[PDB]
Amino acid sequence: EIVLTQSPATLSLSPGERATLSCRASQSVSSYLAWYQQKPGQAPRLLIYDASNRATGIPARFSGSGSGTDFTLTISSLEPEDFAVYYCQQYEFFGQGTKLEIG
């Protein structure tokens, strides 16, 4: 099993701030780290694939990077629409997600 530990579990920030979301793999395995954005009431939306490639229609303020087992999702200049839960993924394995609330 690849245990994906996401921290923080929840986060509340104000518009214009920067959010740094972590996702750490318990094991280092060849895979493509994906990020998902799930807004309230909706299904998940592909946000980042292959760790640092932005999915279709995702603006440049969403940035993903990775180093070994440590991955980071950085959301610059937060906006109210960025209110969502963010999950990371490798193959079948998902992190518990980070609930990002924005005032």
């Binding site: 493509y32 994906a34 299904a43 592909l46």
Partner: peptide, 21 residues
Amino acid sequence: YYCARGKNSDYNWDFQHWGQG
């Protein structure tokens, strides 16, 4: 319960398409 399709056939774990649940 969601059904999901991959972004492309090369790597189907990148779930780009989801059902409404």
